[PDB]
Structures are given as C-alpha cells and as structure tokens.
Amino acid sequence: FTWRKGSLSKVNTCYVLAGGKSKRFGEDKLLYEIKGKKVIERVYETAKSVFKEVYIVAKDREKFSFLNAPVVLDEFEESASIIGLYTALKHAKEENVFVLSGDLPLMKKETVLYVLENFKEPVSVAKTEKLHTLVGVYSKKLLEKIEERIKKGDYRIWALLKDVGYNEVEIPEELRYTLLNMNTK
C-alpha cells in the first residue's frame, strides 16, 4: 500500500519505462513529445508516492535529467518494451518489482495499489479491455526466460507472458480510465 512504504506490500521498488527514441511521427509529433515529458513526470511522482525507490529506465540519461531521478541505463540500440523489462529485472534488488510505463497520463496511485494488493507470482498485470503488460509486478526469477526469448529474437511480451504464465488483475470500473494513453487529434 502507499501510505507507509514497506508495510502492506514487500514490493518496495518500481521501474518507470521511458523507452528509446520517439516513435510518434507526423505534423503534431512535437505536441506529443512535449506533453509526453509532463506525462512521465507525473507517472514518476505517482510511483514515488507508493514506492521507497523508483528508477527511470531509458537509453539516454541526460534526456531525462529533468526528472531529477536515478536512471537505469538501457544499453541496447533496439527500442522494444521487452528490452526495457529485461533492463529493469537485471537491475532489480528485490525478488518482485513494479513496472510502470511512462506514457500513462491518467495513472493514479490507487491503481498501482490495487495491483499490489492483488499480486500473485510470477507476474500480475493490469487488465481493462486491454492487457497492460507494462503495468504490474514482475518477478526477477523471470530474467533467465526473458533473456532466452530476446536472445532467440522473440520480442513479444505477449509470448513471454504465455510462456512464463501470468495473472490478470481486473481493474475496477472507476480506475479503468487511469490506464488510457494520450491521443486524439
């Protein structure tokens, strides 16, 4: 739970995935990139309200100096979510860590806490209409398997999860909007 870190949940660390180079293109790409910085800033602050330690996973440290946060370096050239996950788990200092995508503009601590309350090994991820592979608790014990699949070239987190097994945390109706992304023209 959030109010006292380390009491109700043993998951004390969270990794906020910032990704690599921008993948959004078009005339309005700058609007999304600029708004995107405020978004990850908010996700980071939300995470800090729940966890004792929060790290930003990114390929460029100076690119996120504005967050005044510790960065765990993603040293790969390719930009894939599974690589950010690998980077997070490799760094993990505890058996289970939270993973949170940095592009969720409406994330609220209650959503994170509900997932923590319903955590079950080896992975528990948020589920609305969509499976939120990057909103959940992952076990460091998955490192070997993740590394194996990436090595074999399969970057699909869906395939990874079917392989290792996973638990869906059905997000309560009033918290489903907290998992939306930024879009809409």
Side-chain angles (χ1 to χ4, degrees), residues 1-2 5-185:
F1 209 41
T2 171
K5 316 176 185 307
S7 59
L8 281 62
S9 176
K10 289 296 186 179
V11 178
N12 300 300
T13 75
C14 177
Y15 291 85
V16 175
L17 308 184
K21 297 180 295 180
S22 308
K23 64 168 184 174
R24 174 79 179 201
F25 287 96
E27 285 192 353
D28 300 301
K29 64 177 170 178
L30 191 59
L31 266 181
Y32 290 98
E33 301 174 313
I34 297 306
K35 181 66 278 302
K37 295 173 194 174
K38 294 297 299 186
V39 172
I40 192 172
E41 184 180 64
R42 295 206 293 283
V43 173
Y44 175 61
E45 301 191 302
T46 295
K48 278 270 66 269
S49 73
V50 172
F51 305 101
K52 307 176 68 171
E53 303 190 307
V54 182
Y55 304 89
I56 300 293
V57 174
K59 299 187 184 296
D60 194 312
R61 180 168 286 109
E62 280 301 303
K63 178 174 184 293
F64 294 96
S65 301
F66 74 89
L67 291 177
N68 187 204
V71 178
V72 175
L73 191 68
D74 167 349
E75 313 176 78
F76 292 84
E77 300 294 303
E78 283 177 297
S79 179
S81 297
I82 193 173
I83 290 180
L85 184 61
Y86 165 75
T87 300
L89 294 177
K90 177 182 177 179
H91 180 82
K93 308 307 178 192
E94 300 193 310
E95 179 56 59
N96 300 299
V97 302
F98 206 91
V99 174
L100 191 58
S101 183
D103 65 356
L104 299 167
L106 296 171
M107 183 57 56
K108 278 200 169 186
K109 64 185 302 185
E110 295 98 309
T111 301
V112 175
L113 294 178
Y114 189 72
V115 173
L116 289 179
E117 181 182 314
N118 289 282
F119 169 57
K120 286 173 173 293
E121 294 176 56
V123 182
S124 286
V125 284
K127 176 66 179 298
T128 58
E129 289 296 304
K130 164 182 179 172
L131 180 67
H132 301 89
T133 59
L134 305 180
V135 177
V137 180
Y138 280 76
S139 172
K140 191 182 178 65
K141 293 181 179 182
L142 302 169
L143 193 52
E144 173 176 59
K145 286 261 59 179
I146 296 180
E147 195 182 298
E148 181 178 305
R149 300 193 73 81
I150 296 182
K151 187 282 293 300
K152 291 178 180 179
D154 192 347
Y155 290 17
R156 301 173 295 168
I157 294 177
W158 282 350
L160 169 70
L161 291 182
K162 285 189 163 184
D163 187 358
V164 304
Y166 67 97
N167 301 288
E168 290 189 333
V169 178
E170 183 184 300
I171 298 303
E173 169 57 21
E174 293 199 44
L175 289 182
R176 286 160 60 91
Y177 81 98
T178 68
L179 285 150
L180 296 173
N181 307 75
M182 275 280 102
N183 64 309
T184 68
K185 333 87 67 180

Tab-separated table of all heavy atoms in Angstrom, residues 10-15 51-55 92-94 96-99:
chain	number	residue	atom	x	y	z
A	10	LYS	N	5.565	-5.997	0.035
A	10	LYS	CA	7.010	-6.160	0.096
A	10	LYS	C	7.660	-5.657	-1.183
A	10	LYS	O	8.880	-5.713	-1.337
A	10	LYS	CB	7.373	-7.627	0.336
A	10	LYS	CG	7.059	-8.120	1.743
A	10	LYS	CD	7.882	-7.379	2.792
A	10	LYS	CE	7.669	-7.963	4.183
A	10	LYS	NZ	8.483	-7.267	5.221
A	11	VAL	N	6.837	-5.177	-2.108
A	11	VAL	CA	7.350	-4.627	-3.354
A	11	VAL	C	7.646	-3.167	-3.030
A	11	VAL	O	6.736	-2.342	-2.937
A	11	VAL	CB	6.301	-4.718	-4.491
A	11	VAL	CG1	6.861	-4.099	-5.768
A	11	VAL	CG2	5.924	-6.176	-4.736
A	12	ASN	N	8.924	-2.859	-2.829
A	12	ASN	CA	9.339	-1.507	-2.479
A	12	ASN	C	9.972	-0.717	-3.618
A	12	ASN	O	10.256	0.471	-3.462
A	12	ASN	CB	10.330	-1.555	-1.312
A	12	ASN	CG	9.743	-2.196	-0.074
A	12	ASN	OD1	8.746	-1.722	0.470
A	12	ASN	ND2	10.363	-3.279	0.382
A	13	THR	N	10.196	-1.360	-4.761
A	13	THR	CA	10.821	-0.663	-5.879
A	13	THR	C	9.988	-0.705	-7.157
A	13	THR	O	9.270	-1.670	-7.420
A	13	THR	CB	12.225	-1.236	-6.165
A	13	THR	OG1	12.108	-2.504	-6.817
A	13	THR	CG2	12.984	-1.434	-4.860
A	14	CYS	N	10.090	0.360	-7.945
A	14	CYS	CA	9.349	0.472	-9.193
A	14	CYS	C	10.235	1.009	-10.309
A	14	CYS	O	11.076	1.884	-10.087
A	14	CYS	CB	8.151	1.407	-8.999
A	14	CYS	SG	7.125	1.743	-10.463
A	15	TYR	N	10.030	0.484	-11.512
A	15	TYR	CA	10.783	0.910	-12.680
A	15	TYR	C	9.826	1.554	-13.664
A	15	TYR	O	8.867	0.930	-14.096
A	15	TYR	CB	11.463	-0.288	-13.328
A	15	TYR	CG	12.561	-0.840	-12.473
A	15	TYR	CD1	12.281	-1.761	-11.472
A	15	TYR	CD2	13.873	-0.387	-12.615
A	15	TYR	CE1	13.273	-2.218	-10.622
A	15	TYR	CE2	14.881	-0.839	-11.770
A	15	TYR	CZ	14.570	-1.754	-10.775
A	15	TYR	OH	15.546	-2.208	-9.932
A	51	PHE	N	6.242	3.847	-3.739
A	51	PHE	CA	7.456	3.065	-3.509
A	51	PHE	C	8.638	3.797	-2.882
A	51	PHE	O	8.831	4.994	-3.098
A	51	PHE	CB	7.901	2.448	-4.833
A	51	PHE	CG	6.830	1.635	-5.510
A	51	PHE	CD1	6.096	2.173	-6.566
A	51	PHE	CD2	6.540	0.345	-5.079
A	51	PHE	CE1	5.090	1.437	-7.184
A	51	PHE	CE2	5.533	-0.405	-5.691
A	51	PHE	CZ	4.807	0.142	-6.745
A	52	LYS	N	9.438	3.054	-2.123
A	52	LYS	CA	10.620	3.599	-1.460
A	52	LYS	C	11.659	4.008	-2.499
A	52	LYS	O	12.356	5.010	-2.337
A	52	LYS	CB	11.219	2.552	-0.515
A	52	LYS	CG	10.213	1.985	0.476
A	52	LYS	CD	10.794	0.866	1.338
A	52	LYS	CE	11.855	1.383	2.295
A	52	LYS	NZ	12.257	0.344	3.287
A	53	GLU	N	11.759	3.226	-3.568
A	53	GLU	CA	12.712	3.518	-4.631
A	53	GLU	C	12.053	3.431	-6.002
A	53	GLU	O	11.309	2.492	-6.287
A	53	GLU	CB	13.894	2.552	-4.564
A	53	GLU	CG	14.610	2.565	-3.222
A	53	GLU	CD	15.912	1.794	-3.245
A	53	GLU	OE1	15.899	0.611	-3.650
A	53	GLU	OE2	16.949	2.372	-2.850
A	54	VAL	N	12.327	4.426	-6.838
A	54	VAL	CA	11.781	4.482	-8.189
A	54	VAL	C	12.903	4.813	-9.160
A	54	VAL	O	13.648	5.767	-8.954
A	54	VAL	CB	10.695	5.572	-8.313
A	54	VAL	CG1	10.106	5.563	-9.712
A	54	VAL	CG2	9.608	5.343	-7.282
A	55	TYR	N	13.023	4.020	-10.218
A	55	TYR	CA	14.054	4.250	-11.216
A	55	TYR	C	13.424	4.476	-12.576
A	55	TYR	O	12.332	3.980	-12.855
A	55	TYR	CB	14.998	3.050	-11.320
A	55	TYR	CG	15.643	2.649	-10.017
A	55	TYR	CD1	15.022	1.743	-9.163
A	55	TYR	CD2	16.866	3.192	-9.628
A	55	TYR	CE1	15.598	1.385	-7.953
A	55	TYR	CE2	17.454	2.841	-8.412
A	55	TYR	CZ	16.810	1.936	-7.582
A	55	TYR	OH	17.368	1.580	-6.376
A	92	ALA	N	16.950	-5.063	-10.753
A	92	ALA	CA	16.171	-5.376	-9.552
A	92	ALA	C	16.998	-5.867	-8.365
A	92	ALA	O	17.836	-6.753	-8.510
A	92	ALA	CB	15.099	-6.402	-9.892
A	93	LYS	N	16.749	-5.283	-7.194
A	93	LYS	CA	17.455	-5.662	-5.973
A	93	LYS	C	16.558	-6.504	-5.069
A	93	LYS	O	17.008	-7.029	-4.048
A	93	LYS	CB	17.919	-4.415	-5.216
A	93	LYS	CG	18.705	-3.421	-6.060
A	93	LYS	CD	19.870	-4.075	-6.789
A	93	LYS	CE	20.606	-3.062	-7.658
A	93	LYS	NZ	21.564	-3.715	-8.592
A	94	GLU	N	15.285	-6.617	-5.440
A	94	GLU	CA	14.327	-7.415	-4.681
A	94	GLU	C	13.736	-8.456	-5.633
A	94	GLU	O	13.848	-8.318	-6.849
A	94	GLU	CB	13.216	-6.530	-4.106
A	94	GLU	CG	13.704	-5.443	-3.152
A	94	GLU	CD	12.570	-4.796	-2.376
A	94	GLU	OE1	11.574	-4.383	-3.005
A	94	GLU	OE2	12.672	-4.694	-1.134
A	96	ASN	N	10.573	-9.206	-6.345
A	96	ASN	CA	9.438	-8.737	-7.128
A	96	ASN	C	9.496	-7.219	-7.217
A	96	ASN	O	9.675	-6.540	-6.205
A	96	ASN	CB	8.128	-9.174	-6.469
A	96	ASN	CG	8.017	-10.677	-6.341
A	96	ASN	OD1	8.028	-11.399	-7.339
A	96	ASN	ND2	7.913	-11.163	-5.107
A	97	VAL	N	9.361	-6.685	-8.427
A	97	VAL	CA	9.406	-5.244	-8.611
A	97	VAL	C	8.242	-4.775	-9.468
A	97	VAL	O	7.698	-5.538	-10.272
A	97	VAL	CB	10.734	-4.798	-9.277
A	97	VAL	CG1	11.921	-5.239	-8.421
A	97	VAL	CG2	10.838	-5.373	-10.683
A	98	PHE	N	7.841	-3.521	-9.277
A	98	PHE	CA	6.748	-2.981	-10.064
A	98	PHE	C	7.301	-2.395	-11.357
A	98	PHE	O	8.427	-1.886	-11.396
A	98	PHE	CB	5.991	-1.898	-9.292
A	98	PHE	CG	4.566	-1.748	-9.731
A	98	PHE	CD1	3.557	-2.484	-9.113
A	98	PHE	CD2	4.235	-0.932	-10.804
A	98	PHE	CE1	2.240	-2.413	-9.566
A	98	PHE	CE2	2.921	-0.853	-11.265
A	98	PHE	CZ	1.923	-1.594	-10.648
A	99	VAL	N	6.508	-2.494	-12.418
A	99	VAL	CA	6.878	-1.969	-13.727
A	99	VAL	C	5.737	-1.060	-14.146
A	99	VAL	O	4.566	-1.446	-14.089
A	99	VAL	CB	7.059	-3.101	-14.755
A	99	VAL	CG1	7.295	-2.515	-16.143
A	99	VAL	CG2	8.239	-3.977	-14.354
